[PDB]
Structure 1
Amino acid sequence: IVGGYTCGANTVPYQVSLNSGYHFCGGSLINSQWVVSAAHCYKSGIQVRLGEDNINVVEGNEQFISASKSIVHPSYNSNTLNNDIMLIKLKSAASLNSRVASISLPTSCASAGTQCLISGWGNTKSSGTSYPDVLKCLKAPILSDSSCKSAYPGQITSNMFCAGYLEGGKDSCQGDSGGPVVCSGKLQGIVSWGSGCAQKNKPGVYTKVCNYVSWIKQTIASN
């Protein structure tokens, strides 16, 4: 997160870190056994880390649970990032509490202008590189579809939305991939892609979760 603020420990209780020897992506806990992330975060050997603040220090609220199954969206295209969503099942159910809690799925899509909370452990610099230990947060509005498409000619599908600031300076970045965009207490986006980070006229692009609720629910119901 570039231009954000320190969330505060366990104030984003649905935020997970995906770990394969190191943090490599975010995700969102959606029930005691399932995490939603980006398809571009797919790899083998995932341990889901819940209850994290400092990802380098055991602080006492963590739960570390290995993934038993990953399901990349059937229509994910890794060249265009269309359908950039994946589900991860935990080998055992997380113990839910005030600091480890699921985020509700949307019942409706969110509109341009809605304020959302984007969070992660990604790079905090737009030029140069600095990776934080503690979770970073950014409040950002959903941008209109027309401004999103104008920012990224030929690249924005109906499964994507932009959020952020066209003036630059505030954005998600490398390592925030797969993490949550939460608006009015619902998971509306997944950190997907952008051109650089926090660049003028190049806001972050996010997977439009509301399009996937039926797939998520039916997948969970049979897996």
Structure 2
Amino acid sequence: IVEGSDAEIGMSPWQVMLFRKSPQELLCGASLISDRWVLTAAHCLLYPPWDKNFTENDLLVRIGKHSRTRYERNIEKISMLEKIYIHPRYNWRENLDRDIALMKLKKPVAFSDYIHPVCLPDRETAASLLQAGYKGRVTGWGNLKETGQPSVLQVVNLPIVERPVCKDSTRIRITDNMFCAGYKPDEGKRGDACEGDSGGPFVMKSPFNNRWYQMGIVSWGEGCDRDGKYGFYTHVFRLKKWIQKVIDQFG
């Protein structure tokens, strides 16, 4: 996260770290959506251009974390993966269209002050909140700058951007399964996701029921926090029928 700040304790209790077993290293962010299901970006698990194709036994999820590198004894919980599910129309070839994946945990994780699931939006919450200018919040342990790494989880609040502005900011083909967020050059303020924040959540606090909803997944950008560029996020609601199909069938 570029131009963010240290998270408060318990500020993002749905935050999940995807962790490689060997070598032990951070792979991505992710989010807790129930006691057995974790949501992330498909490219965190499958990205053939970079020879990335993880299997369940390659990975762990670490839940309840604040510190990036510490083993947070008596606070974090570490879970093994039962199964990975990647969207069947995830487009790793071109533009990361449908950049979404689910991971089912081998055993349910116990909720605590530090571990708690985020809500997924329904159609009405998405229609109300996914509007240009409305701000969401992005969290992660990724790079602090485009070209180091944070001691603790970072947080930044960013406005959703009008779709024509998103489209006009890049040569990559945008789809309805994406939205973009960030400040414009004339707005002064700054901030962005960056490499290592992939898969983490873009959340909004509904003013109707005072609950946090995950509207996006950190998906892609061109550099980090560049003037005239924006971060792109998977549109969770647009892909929710797939999420529900997987959870109903498997779970």
TM-score w.r.t. the length of structure 1 is: 0.95
2:208 corresponding residue in structure 1: none
Deviation, 1:8, is 1.9
2:227 pairs, out of 187, 200, 206, with 200
Q: What root-mean-square deviation, in Å, do the aligned CA atoms of Structure 1 and Structure 2 show?
A: 1.2
* Partner-residue secondary structure (3-state), 2:242: helix
Q: Distance in 2 between matches of 1:133 and 1:92?
A: 29
1:38 corresponding residue in structure 2: 41
2:181 corresponding residue in structure 1: 163
- Once the two structures are superposed, residues 190-220 of structure 1 have per-residue CA deviations (whole angstroms, 9 ceiling, x without a partner) of 0000000000111100000011111111211
* Partner-residue secondary structure (3-state), 2:33: strand
Q: Distance in 1 between matches of 2:181 and 2:18?
A: 23
2:245 pairs, out of 194, 215, 218, with 218
TM-score w.r.t. the length of structure 2 is: 0.85
Partners of 2:13 and 2:64 within 8 A in 1: yes
Letter in 2 for 1:201: G
Partners of 1:117 and 1:181 within 8 A in 2: yes
Where in structure 2 are the equivalents of 1:1-223 lying within 5 Å?
Answer: 1-20=1-20, 21-42=24-45, 43-44=54-55, 45-59=58-72, 60-79=74-93, 80-108=95-123, 109=126, 110-126=130-146, 128=147, 130-167=148-185, 169-184=190-205, 185-223=212-250
Q: Residues 5 and 87 (structure 1 numbering): CA distance in 2 closer, same or farther, change over 3 Å?
A: same
2:48 corresponding residue in structure 1: none
Deviation, 1:165, is 1.3
Among the aligned pairs, what percent are the same residue? Answer: 38
Deviation, 1:172, is 0.3
Flag the structure with larger Rg.
2
Deviation, 1:133, is 2.6
* Partner-residue secondary structure (3-state), 2:240: helix
- Once the two structures are superposed, residues 69-108 of structure 1 have per-residue CA deviations (whole angstroms, 9 ceiling, x without a partner) of 0001000010210000000011110101221010000113
Letter in 2 for 1:149: K
Q: Distance in 1 between matches of 2:174 and 2:183?
A: 17
Deviation, 1:10, is 2.7
Which segments of 5 or more consecutive residues in structure 2 lack a partner in the other structure? Answer: 46-53, 206-211
Partners of 2:182 and 2:190 within 8 A in 1: no
* Partner-residue secondary structure (3-state), 1:195: coil
Letter in 1 for 2:29: G
Q: Distance in 2 between matches of 1:87 and 1:112?
A: 28
Deviation, 1:148, is 0.6
* Partner-residue secondary structure (3-state), 2:237: helix
- Once the two structures are superposed, residues 16-67 of structure 1 have per-residue CA deviations (whole angstroms, 9 ceiling, x without a partner) of 0000021110001000000010000002211010000113212331000011
Deviation, 1:154, is 4.6
Q: Distance in 2 between matches of 1:29 and 1:133?
A: 22
